[PDB]
Amino acid sequence: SDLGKKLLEAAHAGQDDEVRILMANGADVNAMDNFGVTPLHLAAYWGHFEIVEVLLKYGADVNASDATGDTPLHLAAKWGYLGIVEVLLKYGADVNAQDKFGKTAFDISIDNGNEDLAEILQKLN
Amino acid sequence: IEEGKLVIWINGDKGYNGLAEVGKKFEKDTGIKVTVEHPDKLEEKFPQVAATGDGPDIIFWAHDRFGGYAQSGLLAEITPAAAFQDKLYPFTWDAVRYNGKLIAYPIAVEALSLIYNKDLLPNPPKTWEEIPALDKELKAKGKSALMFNLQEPYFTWPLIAADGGYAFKYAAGKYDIKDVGVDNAGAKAGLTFLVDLIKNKHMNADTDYSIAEAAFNKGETAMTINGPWAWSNIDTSAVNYGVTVLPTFKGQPSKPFVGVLSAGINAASPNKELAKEFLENYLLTDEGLEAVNKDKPLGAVALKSYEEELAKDPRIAATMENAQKGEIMPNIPQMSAFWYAVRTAVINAASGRQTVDAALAAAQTNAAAGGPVEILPFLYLGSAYHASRKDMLDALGITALINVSANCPNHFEGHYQYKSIPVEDNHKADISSWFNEAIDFIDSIKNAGGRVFVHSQAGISRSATICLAYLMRTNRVKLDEAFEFVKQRRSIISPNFSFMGQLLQFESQVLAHHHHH
């Protein structure tokens, strides 16, 4: 709870070592705030590749949907974070999951101009 | 009041000395003394002293309060000539119409605009949708894109109403008090986008008015959302700022509320003809408004000729443009329910306590019909209908219900703790023998950090009786004081006479040994 909240903040802030310390001390890697947002959601949205990696290594739900329907793959695709998208897929992220508007990661990447990522996602099912 | 003189009330954040200056010119021309005062909380003092038959001859305030004043007969009807009305934009006269009658003179037009830091952002965004990407860039430089007051719905409404939200529907010269537009698709879309900004960390749900103003005026955030009343503090900060049209959402203009600063004539004034001459021939002139505007800016103004001069300033052109794309604040008394309902919905959605759909569904009913009432921060009162509305219970933070009935179902077991008090609403029911058990349950939930919703079938007799008993016992007060307290908040309470008897007997039991201290 207390550590979960600090892990959410450190994952958002991109503080690699703080994330590792909080995890070693027992912060739930699947902690949720009131929006159902998890550290993996925040690390993906804010572009923290190394934090995404370590969270997934220790059991972060790659397919967690927050209270609004967003998955980590949705959030990374908004910004065209190809490295993060690749490791999400490697851990079993569902390319076909839809957000609250019915959009997949592919749709989302186009909606924010990241058509380099759209081209890679288009080859996937 | 006093004959042959004019007394004017206007808020302290307005150009009251410019106004006083217009009064002096009136006094010089006519011999009629004009006195301008700015009492603290004058919008509350006015309905009290004016019902007496005193107070000012003229009161300046945003038009939305004036519908309530007019309901209580506190404002004189005005009948300006069409040749005079044509000096002002037609929509400003609409804002001062109540029951088909004009009840004030429009003065100024107030709407929120986008205020941006030209040094951090020479080209402000045209759309809301691009603000997340902008915040990504600015966060990389230790700044943020946007901070504004998330505690008051007045400030979030422009986004919520953009795609189709509205307060009360206006048709055929009248507001339909049952047609509220807070839970339609447009309102849901706008609040959903606001929540996305917060849950993704572009904004903080705890940002209030002071926090946002300080951050903008210190160069920490590229944008804020605020009105002309804020320009002076920014001028002092020496931030190089612009004021522009609000971003669009789904290609639709942001739709801010529009307030028309207006001058109403006290129905009790003995100087109504004098007040009209002052307002029509002295204040509502280029020179009169210029005198007031010099003191503290009015923003945009209702007088066409002077608005065309002022609009050369792009901050004022932007104020008027945002007002053209906005929504006149309804002037009906039901707006008090609207403001409370939507304030709760936005705070709950911004904190994640409720989904967007549930938050707006509850606010819709609260604004258009009614809802459970707060007695104490942990104690709420209402009907069996309310006990079937999970969205309305969650909106209040309910964690437990006392079902004071023999027949009413428990709809949400496993979401809330339930306590049954199985009595009928009749003269034979012994409700006082349940008082201690009910009070102990309320306190138990209270001390565990919860909140109790007490209900019966109608929420007027059995459940009101339990709340009254709680108040008398906890605060050591008499029935008459507790009853007045609850009646003030839920005016339809009416415990049956036998329950009133049992409460009066409880009162002497609660207070039997009180006289010693």
Author numbering:
A (entry chain B): 12 to 136
B (entry chain A): 3 to 519
Direct quotes from the study:
To investigate whether these MBP-specific DARPins can also help to promote the crystallization of MBP fusion proteins, we tested the two MBP-specific DARPins off7 and mbp3_16 (DARPin 16) in concert with MBP fused to cata­lytically inactive DUSP1 CD (Cys258Ser). The DUSP fold is virtually identical in all of the structures of the DUSP1 CD, indicating that the presence of MBP and the MBP-binding proteins did not distort its structure.
The maltose-free or ‘open’ form of the MBP-DUSP1 CD fusion protein was crystallized in complex with DARPin off7, while both the maltose-free and maltose-bound or ‘closed’ forms of the fusion protein were crystallized in complex with DARPin 16, yielding a total of three different crystal structures. The structure of MBP-DUSP1 CD in complex with DARPin 16 reveals for the first time how this DARPin interacts with MBP. Surprisingly, even though the amino acids in the designed regions of DARPin 16 and off7 appear to be dissimilar when their sequences are aligned, the two molecules bind to the same site on MBP and adopt remarkably similar poses. On the other hand, in the crystal structures of the MBP-DUSP1 CD in complex with DARPin 16, helix α1 residues are occluded by a crystal contact with a neighboring molecule, rendering these crystal forms less advantageous for crystallographic fragment screening.
